[PDB]
Design a protein around this ligand. Structure first.
Ligand code: 5NL
Ligand code: NA
Length: 456
């Protein structure tokens, strides 16, 4: 048995996140520095209004993906790490999951840094003392301890941050536009003086930013409110009410702040609003500076933990269930995370990570197909928590599922500017024949699937 109280399905009575609450989780989660960089550098190839469109479109495809990747986590309360055991082996799943726990772990050390940068700036703007590594650890530590309260903290931190973050941001837009003496409509077309990038590849950059989060949204949405006694059609609207809720959460947030990064590039040549606003206004008081850094800190705290630390935690305590618990996996994830010192390799590896990211397309494709198409939403929680059962396949690993991944990754390369969507579509389509083959050797269903509700 692989079950322990932390990696256990989340019982109907334990659920705490409704449709309104999830948007407030996503809105603040979308407000973060790394879109500034992304949306800023985009002004090199397109003008601001198209980037906003590349953002809304890229935001929506992520949501179209969420409607599907979230449906199993909401209904059955299960892990990401646990759920992968289905198509890949119980152990074979550890391969893509290790790729993914790694991305996630990377992103955690990047934002701890940006956060650290903020706190260190707040302090050195009060004392000239300027030690970052100490502020790194201390920040890593602070998140973990607030992460100990799992989704309970996250949901509360984000409902109060959201309007504040929304307000600090709308304010920011006023300050830029005013101090430069420019209307909104004027800034909306100032970019794109170096065309070359396909607009599809533009859209693919905003999707693929949240590719880690969306492919493993599970770790968030297993906490969502569900009515166990719905139907096919009430379950679909439930899924849809949530997918819509995630849309209303990540779109208006990342559009306002995407625009700020782009505006920054376009007004002063820097994606970083700290620089661009400082200039345009010609310096600012130490208070109003510290604020901005508080923004960065508030903007980092509402995104890093929930998106980057939750999922390796659950990966640890659920693969080594007697070795790790949720709280200890969190400590081990933030430590592994920081000891990768990713803030000195983000510059370099940029193009490399975009590859690893869009190579999760088959993972999402194989997972959507396994649960929805092959098995028809009919799963056995019982077997997911046991070393030997219908999800063990060949001695813990489903090599045929690992084959579809490779194959789909290859085919993915035939369309570099649409890589992600072809490999998913390829894996999705290939899992079907691959699984109708494996079903001749191993069973796709189990008797024990009637104990499902016991877990809930
Ligand atoms: O899963 C994740 N955890 C994270 O910290 C990042 C956040 C992120 C980074 C870059 C982006 C670039 C373009 C659009 C969205 C982006 C989002 N992703
Ligand atoms: Na945030």
């Amino acid at each position: 048995s692989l079950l322990n109280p932390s990696n256990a399905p989340t019982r109907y009575a334990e659920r705490s996140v409704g449709p309104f609450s999830l948007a407030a989780i996503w809105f603040a989660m979308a407000i973060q520095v790394a879109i500034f960089i992304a949306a800023g550098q985009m002004t090199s190839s397109f003008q601001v209004w198209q980037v906003i469109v590349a953002i809304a479109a890229g935001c929506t495809i992520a949501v179209i993906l969420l409607f599907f990747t979230q449906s199993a986590a909401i209904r059955w309360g299960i892990n990401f790490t646990v759920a992968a055991r289905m198509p890949f082996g119980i152990r074979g799943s550890l391969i893509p999951i290790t790729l993914k726990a790694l991305l996630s772990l990377f992103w955690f050390g990047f934002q701890t840094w940006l956060g650290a940068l903020a706190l260190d700036e707040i302090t050195r703007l009060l004392t000239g003392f300027t030690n970052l590594p100490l502020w790194i650890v201390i920040f890593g530590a602070i998140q973990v301890v607030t992460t100990f309260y799992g989704i309970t903290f996250i949901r509360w931190m984000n409902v109060f941050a959201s309007p504040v973050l929304l307000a600090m941001g709308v304010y920011m837009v006023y300050l830029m536009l005013d101090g430069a003496d420019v209307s909104l409509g004027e800034v909306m077309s100032m970019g794109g003086e170096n065309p070359g990038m396909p607009f599809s590849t533009a859209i693919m950059i905003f999707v693929g930013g949240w590719i880690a989060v969306v492919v493993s949204i599970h770790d968030i949405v297993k906490e969502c409110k569900v009515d166990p006694n719905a139907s096919r059609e009430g379950q679909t609207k439930a899924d849809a009410r949530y997918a819509t809720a995630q849309w209303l959460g990540m779109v208006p947030a990342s559009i306002i702040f995407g625009f700020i990064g782009a505006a920054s590039m376009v007004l002063v040549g820097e994606w970083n609003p700290v620089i661009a606003i400082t200039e345009v206004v010609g310096g600012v008081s130490i208070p109003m500076a510290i604020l901005f850094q508080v923004f960065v800190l508030l903007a980092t705290w509402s995104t890093n933990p929930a998106a980057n630390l939750l999922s390796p935690a659950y990966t640890l305590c659920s693969t080594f269930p007697r070795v790790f618990t949720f709280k200890t996996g969190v400590i081990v994830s933030a430590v592994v995370g920081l000891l990768m010192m990713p803030w000195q390799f983000a510059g370099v590896l940029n193009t490399f990570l975009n590859l690893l990211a869009s190579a999760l397309g088959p993972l999402a494709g194989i997972m959507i197909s396994d649960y929805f198409l092959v098995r028809r939403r009919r799963i056995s929680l019982h077997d997911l928590y046991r070393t030997k059962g219908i999800y063990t396949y060949w001695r813990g690993v489903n090599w045929v599922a690992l084959a579809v991944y490779a194959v789909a990754l290859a085919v993915s390369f035939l369309t570099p500017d649409l890589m992600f969507v072809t490999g998913l579509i390829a894996a999705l389509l290939l899992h079907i024949p691959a699984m109708r083959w494996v079903a001749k050797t191993f069973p796709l269903f189990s008797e024990a699937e009637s104990r499902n509700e016991d877990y809930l």
